[PDB]
Enzyme design. Structure first.
Site, PDB file in Angstrom:
ATOM      1  N   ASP A  96     -14.392 -28.069 -22.843  1.00  9.39           N
ATOM      2  CA  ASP A  96     -13.744 -29.165 -22.133  1.00  9.39           C
ATOM      3  C   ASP A  96     -13.623 -30.536 -22.762  1.00  9.39           C
ATOM      4  O   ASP A  96     -12.606 -31.198 -22.600  1.00  9.39           O
ATOM      5  CB  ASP A  96     -14.449 -29.365 -20.796  1.00  9.39           C
ATOM      6  CG  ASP A  96     -14.367 -28.157 -19.929  1.00  9.39           C
ATOM      7  OD1 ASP A  96     -13.242 -27.750 -19.574  1.00  9.39           O
ATOM      8  OD2 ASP A  96     -15.433 -27.608 -19.605  1.00  9.39           O
ATOM      9  N   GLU A 110     -11.972 -34.523  -9.136  1.00 10.27           N
ATOM     10  CA  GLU A 110     -10.561 -34.195  -9.310  1.00 10.27           C
ATOM     11  C   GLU A 110      -9.601 -34.344  -8.134  1.00 10.27           C
ATOM     12  O   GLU A 110      -8.945 -33.378  -7.750  1.00 10.27           O
ATOM     13  CB  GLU A 110     -10.500 -32.764  -9.841  1.00 10.27           C
ATOM     14  CG  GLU A 110     -11.304 -32.618 -11.122  1.00 10.27           C
ATOM     15  CD  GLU A 110     -11.481 -31.189 -11.573  1.00 10.27           C
ATOM     16  OE1 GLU A 110     -11.454 -30.281 -10.721  1.00 10.27           O
ATOM     17  OE2 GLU A 110     -11.655 -30.976 -12.789  1.00 10.27           O
ATOM     18  N   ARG A 137     -12.125 -32.002  -4.714  1.00 11.36           N
ATOM     19  CA  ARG A 137     -12.993 -30.846  -4.926  1.00 11.36           C
ATOM     20  C   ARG A 137     -14.471 -31.246  -4.730  1.00 11.36           C
ATOM     21  O   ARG A 137     -14.971 -32.154  -5.392  1.00 11.36           O
ATOM     22  CB  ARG A 137     -12.749 -30.303  -6.362  1.00 11.36           C
ATOM     23  CG  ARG A 137     -13.842 -29.427  -7.002  1.00 11.36           C
ATOM     24  CD  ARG A 137     -13.528 -29.214  -8.487  1.00 11.36           C
ATOM     25  NE  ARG A 137     -14.532 -28.402  -9.177  1.00 11.36           N
ATOM     26  CZ  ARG A 137     -14.342 -27.800 -10.350  1.00 11.36           C
ATOM     27  NH1 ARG A 137     -13.172 -27.910 -10.974  1.00 11.36           N
ATOM     28  NH2 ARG A 137     -15.317 -27.081 -10.907  1.00 11.36           N
ATOM     29  N   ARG A 181      -9.901 -17.515 -10.204  1.00  9.66           N
ATOM     30  CA  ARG A 181      -8.652 -18.268 -10.264  1.00  9.66           C
ATOM     31  C   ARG A 181      -7.523 -17.293 -10.513  1.00  9.66           C
ATOM     32  O   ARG A 181      -6.917 -17.235 -11.589  1.00  9.66           O
ATOM     33  CB  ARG A 181      -8.744 -19.337 -11.357  1.00  9.66           C
ATOM     34  CG  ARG A 181      -9.858 -20.324 -11.064  1.00  9.66           C
ATOM     35  CD  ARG A 181     -10.244 -21.160 -12.265  1.00  9.66           C
ATOM     36  NE  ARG A 181     -11.178 -22.205 -11.855  1.00  9.66           N
ATOM     37  CZ  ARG A 181     -11.583 -23.204 -12.634  1.00  9.66           C
ATOM     38  NH1 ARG A 181     -11.142 -23.288 -13.882  1.00  9.66           N
ATOM     39  NH2 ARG A 181     -12.438 -24.113 -12.164  1.00  9.66           N
ATOM     40  N   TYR A 217      -5.869 -24.734 -11.966  1.00 11.55           N
ATOM     41  CA  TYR A 217      -5.752 -26.026 -11.281  1.00 11.55           C
ATOM     42  C   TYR A 217      -4.387 -26.192 -10.590  1.00 11.55           C
ATOM     43  O   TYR A 217      -3.394 -25.574 -10.966  1.00 11.55           O
ATOM     44  CB  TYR A 217      -5.942 -27.183 -12.279  1.00 11.55           C
ATOM     45  CG  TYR A 217      -7.376 -27.520 -12.614  1.00 11.55           C
ATOM     46  CD1 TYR A 217      -8.418 -26.622 -12.334  1.00 11.55           C
ATOM     47  CD2 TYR A 217      -7.705 -28.761 -13.181  1.00 11.55           C
ATOM     48  CE1 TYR A 217      -9.738 -26.953 -12.599  1.00 11.55           C
ATOM     49  CE2 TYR A 217      -9.027 -29.103 -13.452  1.00 11.55           C
ATOM     50  CZ  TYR A 217     -10.030 -28.193 -13.153  1.00 11.55           C
ATOM     51  OH  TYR A 217     -11.331 -28.528 -13.384  1.00 11.55           O
TER      52      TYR A 217
END
Ligand SMILES: *[C@@H]1O[C@H](CO)[C@@H](O[C@@H]2O[C@H](CO)[C@@H](O[C@@H]3O[C@H](CO[C@H]4O[C@H](CO)[C@@H](O)[C@H](O)[C@@H]4O)[C@@H](O)[C@H](O[C@H]4O[C@H](CO)[C@@H](O)[C@H](O)[C@@H]4O[C@H]4O[C@H](CO)[C@@H](O)[C@H](O)[C@@H]4O[C@H]4O[C@H](CO)[C@@H](O)[C@H](O)[C@@H]4O)[C@@H]3O)[C@H](O)[C@H]2NC(C)=O)[C@H](O)[C@H]1NC(C)=O
Ligand SMILES: *[C@@H]1O[C@H](CO)[C@@H](O[C@@H]2O[C@H](CO)[C@@H](O[C@@H]3O[C@H](CO[C@H]4O[C@H](CO)[C@@H](O)[C@H](O)[C@@H]4O)[C@@H](O)[C@H](O[C@H]4O[C@H](CO)[C@@H](O)[C@H](O)[C@@H]4O[C@H]4O[C@H](CO)[C@@H](O)[C@H](O)[C@@H]4O[C@H]4O[C@H](CO)[C@@H](O)[C@H](O)[C@@H]4O)[C@@H]3O)[C@H](O)[C@H]2NC(C)=O)[C@H](O)[C@H]1NC(C)=O
Ligand SMILES: *[C@@H]1O[C@H](CO)[C@@H](O[C@@H]2O[C@H](CO)[C@@H](O[C@@H]3O[C@H](CO[C@H]4O[C@H](CO)[C@@H](O)[C@H](O)[C@@H]4O)[C@@H](O)[C@H](O[C@H]4O[C@H](CO)[C@@H](O)[C@H](O)[C@@H]4O[C@H]4O[C@H](CO)[C@@H](O)[C@H](O)[C@@H]4O[C@H]4O[C@H](CO)[C@@H](O)[C@H](O)[C@@H]4O)[C@@H]3O)[C@H](O)[C@H]2NC(C)=O)[C@H](O)[C@H]1NC(C)=O
Ligand SMILES: *[C@@H]1O[C@H](CO)[C@@H](O[C@@H]2O[C@H](CO)[C@@H](O[C@@H]3O[C@H](CO[C@H]4O[C@H](CO)[C@@H](O)[C@H](O)[C@@H]4O)[C@@H](O)[C@H](O[C@H]4O[C@H](CO)[C@@H](O)[C@H](O)[C@@H]4O[C@H]4O[C@H](CO)[C@@H](O)[C@H](O)[C@@H]4O[C@H]4O[C@H](CO)[C@@H](O)[C@H](O)[C@@H]4O)[C@@H]3O)[C@H](O)[C@H]2NC(C)=O)[C@H](O)[C@H]1NC(C)=O
Ligand SMILES: CC(=O)N[C@H]1[C@H]([C@H](O)[C@H](O)CN)OC(C(=O)O)=C[C@@H]1N
Ligand SMILES: CC(=O)N[C@H]1[C@H]([C@H](O)[C@H](O)CN)OC(C(=O)O)=C[C@@H]1N
Ligand SMILES: CC(=O)N[C@H]1[C@H]([C@H](O)[C@H](O)CN)OC(C(=O)O)=C[C@@H]1N
Ligand SMILES: CC(=O)N[C@H]1[C@H]([C@H](O)[C@H](O)CN)OC(C(=O)O)=C[C@@H]1N
Ligand SMILES: *[C@@H]1O[C@H](CO)[C@@H](O)[C@H](O)[C@H]1NC(C)=O
Ligand SMILES: *[C@@H]1O[C@H](CO)[C@@H](O)[C@H](O)[C@H]1NC(C)=O
Ligand SMILES: *[C@@H]1O[C@H](CO)[C@@H](O)[C@H](O)[C@H]1NC(C)=O
Ligand SMILES: *[C@@H]1O[C@H](CO)[C@@H](O)[C@H](O)[C@H]1NC(C)=O
Ligand SMILES: *[C@@H]1O[C@H](CO)[C@@H](O)[C@H](O)[C@H]1NC(C)=O
Ligand SMILES: [Ca+2]
Ligand SMILES: [Ca+2]
Ligand SMILES: [Ca+2]
Ligand SMILES: [Ca+2]
Ligand SMILES: [Ca+2]
Lengths: 388, 388, 388, 388
Positions: D70, D197, D212, D290, D324
């Site tokens: 990240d 976020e 979130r 996801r 996302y």
């Protein structure tokens, strides 16, 4: 500035001169060129660009495998600079979808893309690069549109759509948009029996569209639209010089209000300029496949069922692959008349060249000249062997 | 804005400074650079760009095989930013064809491209990026033009064309265009016996073109045009310093009104600045091949048949490949005089370097300085071995 | 619009924040990134861009072999969008040469490139993207200039040039240009004994340049210019915190008017902001090689021969390669003060990493903050092994 | 021009139409596409663009190995043309960092990037493409922000930041910026227990953010901001239709002021449009990963703890990877209402597809229609096998 009005008539077409050619397949053999199909050309008041439906992959890319397929979620209408190839880096996405049309009204551009599954497609109408209106499928069977530019008059831009069967009666509608909003729509009227992929142009406040009767006709249906009254008529080109493909051999007398028989359930997008003696028809040279391309001057083709050629010009040799063709004009040029133009899609790959796993095309485009110019042929130019 | 008028005289040329260089072949060894040839440079009021005839393929592409050939349907006049290489992604197509010229008149640009088969070629004249006029071949034998920029004065932009034999008398015409339309044309007059590829520049309302007599002359023919009266004269550079290639060795006295003999049916596009004592001639160093390049100050070269060099500057070593060369100037620069400029085409590949299957070039360009600057040589710089 | 005037003082530097980083070498491992070196940053009134000297080849290209060499005919000053890498397709050539400087005066930009052989180099001064003035070598020994931006005040843009030995006395000149024309030049004066590669900035009508004494000094020479009187002075940074490289270890007292001894005939381009207590010095962490980079707040460094650090910030770890560094500021930003900025060249390849045959770099740049921000290190980030 | 004011309410959402899709991973298999993640969309008054955090390498590049990580010094916020992929050549760097937000206030754009090590990160606020303000970490534990666009009203653009633990109470702050300067900031208030976020949108002078709760909630926290009073409140979406991921199965009654339990220390950025009966929630189809994405109309979701779906639309099949998602709207479109839009990040590669060493994504985006349009699914479309 102000909305463009179709105030001029067509210039006299005595021959065709080269206008644009991108050599996309040749160049893309070693550069990041997107796989496309269903190309066209369209002008803005200050620029003319190439348009097409990308397949969302480069030609050399591994995802080029399977691009013979027509409708996927990876397609989009893209535009790019005149005669440049459609590359990953210079292609501008106008909207997402697998069927489209686009035109400038003098103030800004309207682009339409249809997407979705066969039974649940929808059109999204963009104006000034923003989505404005949406239209859901009415027949739940591949809602589809022109695949070439629409034409506007005082802000009104008619567009022909078809939803329904490709091998029997379907539901064709003419929508009249202004600033991306629906002013009116009407069901197809007249004697045309099936309509697909209309190629249009405008002159003296009238819009003429030459389409494809996929169901039964080898002659092409013609829709003439009055953008002020927002009304239209339809018929077929009367001339025995047949212009769809595949098609039977040319007879001595054609059909004015019915499909000329001989070939069913197939065809190719095409076009024509119907202007009395100043009438020119485009067609593939082959009656069996999308091979070659020629322009034929056929005086009064629209209304004379025995009309034959008086002049002609070869555009692509019968030994070279052609494909879709359509009309466009630069309505913002100088002079007293509109110069007729057209493009020919040069399809490479599948199904005709199956040594490769992809299907793509390049573009060649020409405009009319009042001179009687010498002719050349304009093939795609790529060597399939290089791609093996 | 307003049409540009050639109101200034040439600046005094005391040496040449580096202006632009794209290193196209070096860079294209590993980037998407288009194969080209017949390059030149031309300015707009707000920008100067490189121009050339693309071959419609990248250098590393498999379609680069065979690019030694001059006329194909895959060629186009392209322009791109000064000193950048001509890439697939930054090259702007001006028109389609295999022979060209282009120039800005102060308001907008006129570009001309000729295409077609040898016996049926045609020129299309574009103005403001739109096709305006077309001219059919008059001698049916490779209609062809300058391959470098034209020059305008108060909207009138003369262009020299030749149609006919390359090894005997041909039909040369001087066309006077304004806004892309033909005002007048006239047949070549004067004592020049054969004309090809004119390199032009303007100063004080007169346009001077130094061309190539392919048939018999090793001295170069010169056409001087009055763009107001739209008339011209022609002769040869008198000086014994011969500037075509191939050519015989330099004699002590040249020829003013006839081709200097010794070499037939061949040559190379070249140029000169003929301005009294401020006269400079460009030429390849080799008398046998397109090798090396030098500038020589030869006072009164145009009118003095015994004129010899008084100063010089080497541009490309005789151990490096050169090629075509031509004139251009930035008519929109500041100051009281026009600064003479030129470019040299550095040809790589066939026929001189046949280990590769292609032919291309890079560009080097210089402009004059009133200083007496030190000199450097400017080769293409690529290693052919890398392409094997 | 109007010429920019250095009316503001420097903002208080309490720390440095990340401004730009292009990760050029990482990205260029698999994209068409040009090989470069001698980078810098410079702003226009509406945009700030990265600048550097291209080597006329991509990093992955075969011509990257040998790019450790400094002066070739294939180099050019290029600029490209902030934090993007210098690619073949986005790099704009400002001029041709192997030594440069460039700056905007508020109306337009002046760019200078020097080219030629060691004994016959020349500078060409471009203004508004057109060549305006040329200056021939005066000492015939590598005419060379800043390698970072110049600074302008009311149209006057001083530039420091050196011609002559790199290991003994040389001939340094300060030229004052306005609109690309020479207003005046003067020979270096003051106590600086050798000058190379000046890094400059301006505030309150004064231009400060921190340079490189290649001959004898490990402390850096400083030239302060009055652009209105067009006069200057020179000395050395007094502080014992030595900032050239290679260099001896830091002593307790420095030298104000002579080179601090210990290392001869070598160095690296560097910079500083000399503003009383708001003084910050940049330097490599290693005293032996171009490794690491740190900023040190050394109050009164210019005038205090015993000045030591009171605060600091690491920019590049000593375990990572650094290189040239220089100053620039956005003179067109909002606010009441000029925000000090700098860039560090992160050299990769030869001579330190000789498993590859090339030499290139990426760029990292930072600007000052009035906050006391946390610090991070910013390495080039590429893995040389990937290039093998 | 003038600052934009949120004067309109949301248009009625009866379905969602395709807005943009870049097919980045498909295309990047054979073109210079940058590896990214954390994408979003944001409009300027004259253009809407895609945004994301680059990893400073192409997907095919060797440096793509390890991009599952990240925070590195090689990341930057980039923007590029709508529906085009993020390429090396068309991506514009807005700032350097590994967490971001950006929004246009009607006059110009504000972009924020956070960079640095975990315990010493800092945010730099850019306005009009220049750095203006910096904010140091206050909790020394990964200062981080929205990863989607902020929203402005009369020049005031609130932004939500969090510094501190991702698995316990953290320090969230709401900063109110105007022209890149801090007008005020305040600590999070209300009943939301953890914030990360935030996905925001504005209508009728109120800004709504759906965030979130990484620590404990499977329902999503909601922050509503008054940009004039510069005050806010917070709570959770009451509805039992849970929208974070991973999450427990949907219950029959949700929680309005506390995290709905069942899953700790994990989540995904998401969004919603809370407008009475015109309320639509987005969520992954899978409760474990996801995978998939759907929009559900849940009338009064924010305030009704028993609210269930009344309509829905599948965006991505559960057999395809998502990621996302966030909100954005074109505040400069025509009409009387703001058209709700959203994007879904389609993550490819690690950790779910570990045959490749990289992690990247493509983007799909949709906007609302007042029509009840047919639905299609929109997968990334790339074949991982091709990358092996
Ligand atoms: C330099 O350039 C110039 C400029 O281009 C060149 O000159 C051009 O030359 C062209 C070729 O000769 C010429 O084009 C032809 O024109 C004919 C019309 O002109 C003639 O007829 C009129 C009418 O009385 C006269 O006034 C005139 O003087 C001429 O005599 C067309 O009829 C030609 O088209 C037909 O032939 C071609 C094959 O060449 C077919 O491809 C085309 O489709 C036409 O023929 C088919 O269709 C008709 C109509 O139904 C049928 O009757 C016929 O049998 C054919 O049908 C079969 O084939 C089709 C297609 O495959 C299939 O569907 C069907 O089923 C059947 O199987 C042609 O267009 C230009 O007009 C002329 N231009 C000028 C300005 O002069 C010059 O040559 C060049 N110079 C050099 C040295 O090369
Ligand atoms: C730093 O940079 C500066 C600036 O560039 C350098 O100084 C320059 O130096 C140049 C080289 O010496 C010089 O260029 C030469 O100038 C000569 C003219 O100047 C001389 O003559 C006049 C006349 O009386 C005097 O006033 C003056 O003081 C000089 O003495 C030219 O004549 C030179 O060109 C000729 O030689 C070259 C070979 O070097 C040929 O390539 C060229 O074509 C010319 O010679 C051919 O042509 C003539 C004319 O017909 C024939 O007579 C001759 O025999 C040759 O013919 C053969 O070759 C040609 C071509 O291959 C072929 O076609 C033919 O058939 C025959 O086979 C040359 O141009 C610059 O003027 C000078 N500049 C300045 C400002 O000083 C300086 O050296 C550099 N410093 C360092 C340290 O390097
Ligand atoms: C979060 O981020 C913040 C913000 O960045 C971090 O806080 C920063 O921490 C930095 C590291 O500690 C600190 O930087 C140092 O500051 C020192 C000055 O401050 C101290 O002295 C003053 C003076 O009395 C006090 O007021 C103050 O309170 C401090 O005590 C500098 O002196 C430091 O530089 C010197 O050390 C480094 C090694 O760390 C060298 O690289 C550097 O060159 C300096 O030392 C060399 O040079 C001096 C001068 O000649 C010599 O005396 C010395 O011996 C060294 O010489 C050798 O090495 C050089 C270089 O290789 C060679 O040329 C020579 O020959 C010799 O061999 C350093 O700059 C920041 O100021 C501080 N910032 C703030 C706002 O607090 C915080 O830590 C981070 N948090 C976490 C949790 O990580
Ligand atoms: C052409 O296109 C049109 C336009 O798109 C197509 O028509 C659309 O068809 C959709 C599919 O049928 C439809 O979407 C569904 O709408 C339902 C709501 O409508 C129904 O209920 C109301 C309420 O009384 C009625 O008024 C109405 O008439 C309908 O009967 C939703 O309820 C649906 O969502 C639920 O189902 C899907 C699976 O299909 C789940 O993925 C989704 O999450 C919802 O179900 C979960 O969540 C609820 C709420 O908690 C639970 O109760 C339920 O058990 C499920 O929970 C499990 O799964 C979730 C997710 O994995 C997990 O978290 C949880 O723990 C549990 O395990 C769905 O949204 C459109 O509204 C409709 N549009 C229109 C305009 O008609 C048409 O079909 C197309 N034509 C063709 C020919 O294809
Ligand atoms: C919407 C769509 O798929 N259009 C496709 C079209 C139709 O299949 C045809 O009009 C029959 N209905 O055919 C062809 C074709 O090359 O023949 C290409 C188009 N991509
Ligand atoms: C129109 C055309 O083909 N021009 C070509 C030209 C002619 O062949 C020559 O002028 C003799 N007529 O020759 C050359 C050449 O490098 O020598 C290149 C040009 N491409
Ligand atoms: C004009 C020129 O070649 N400049 C070069 C410069 C000089 O050699 C040095 O200033 C000694 N005179 O050195 C370096 C260097 O990395 O050290 C790079 C520059 N390309
Ligand atoms: C600043 C940062 O690293 N943000 C990362 C974020 C946080 O780790 C999470 O919000 C828990 N605190 O997680 C994810 C993720 O795909 O889940 C991606 C973001 N790059
Ligand atoms: C087109 O016609 C309408 C008159 O109805 C007028 O509004 C418009 O100005 C005309 N367009 C142009 C370019 O004149
Ligand atoms: C060029 O000359 C004509 C006068 O004949 C004039 O119209 C024009 O304005 C002149 N151009 C410029 C730039 O002054
Ligand atoms: C800079 O100063 C001079 C006054 O000498 C003035 O001409 C110019 O307008 C000033 N520049 C600006 C931007 O005000
Ligand atoms: C937004 O509101 C403020 C009034 O407070 C006004 O200044 C501004 O002009 C408004 N913006 C627009 C676009 O009208
Ligand atoms: C990627 O990185 C890992 C960790 O260093 C290494 O083991 C692996 O071999 C690498 N794979 C490639 C293809 O570089
Ligand atoms: Ca048919
Ligand atoms: Ca000759
Ligand atoms: Ca490549
Ligand atoms: Ca030194
Ligand atoms: Ca959670």
């Amino acid at each position: 500035r102000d909305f463009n009005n179709l105030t001029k008539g067509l210039c006299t077409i005595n021959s065709w001169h080269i206008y644009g050619k991108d050599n996309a397949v040749r160049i893309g053999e070693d550069s990041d060129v997107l796989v496309t199909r269903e190309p066209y050309v369209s002008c803005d008041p200050d620029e003319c660009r190439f348009y097409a439906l990308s397949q969302g992959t480069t030609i050399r890319g591994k995802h080029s495998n399977g691009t013979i397929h027509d409708r996927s979620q990876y397609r989009a209408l893209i535009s790019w600079p005149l005669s440049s190839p459609p590359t990953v880096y210079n292609s501008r996405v106008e909207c997402i979808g697998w069927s489209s049309t686009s035109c400038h009204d003098g103030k800004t551009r309207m682009s339409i893309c249809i997407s979705g599954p066969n039974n649940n497609a929808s059109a999204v109408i963009w104006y000034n690069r923003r989505p404005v209106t949406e239209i859901n499928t009415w027949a739940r069977n591949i809602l589809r549109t022109q695949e070439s530019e629409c034409v506007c008059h005082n802000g009104v831009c008619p567009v022909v759509f078809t939803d329904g069967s490709a091998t029997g009666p379907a539901e064709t509608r003419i929508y009249y948009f202004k600033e991306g909003k629906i002013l009116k729509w009407e069901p197809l009227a007249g004697t045309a029996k099936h309509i697909e992929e209309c190629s249009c142009y405008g002159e003296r406040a009238e819009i003429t569209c030459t389409c494809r009767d996929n169901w039964q006709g080898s002659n092409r249906p013609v829709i003439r639209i009055d953008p002020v009254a927002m009304t239209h008529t339809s018929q077929y080109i009367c001339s025995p010089v047949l212009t769809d493909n595949p098609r039977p051999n040319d007879p001595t007398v054609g059909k004015c209000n019915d499909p000329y028989p001989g070939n069913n359930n197939n065809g190719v997008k095409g076009f024509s300029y119907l202007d009395g003696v100043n009438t020119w028809l485009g067609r593939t040279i082959s009656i069996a496949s999308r091979s070659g391309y020629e322009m034929l001057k056929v005086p009064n083709a629209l209304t004379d069922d025995k009309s034959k050629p008086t002049q002609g010009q070869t555009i692509v040799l019968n030994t070279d692959w052609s494909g879709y063709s359509g009309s466009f004009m630069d309505y913002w040029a100088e002079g007293e008349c509109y110069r007729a133009c057209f493009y020919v899609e040069l399809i490479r790959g599948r199904p005709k060249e199956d040594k490769v796993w992809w299907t793509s095309n390049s573009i060649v485009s020409m405009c009319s000249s009042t001179e009687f110019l010498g002719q050349w042929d304009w093939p795609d130019g790529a060597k399939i062997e290089y791609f093996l």
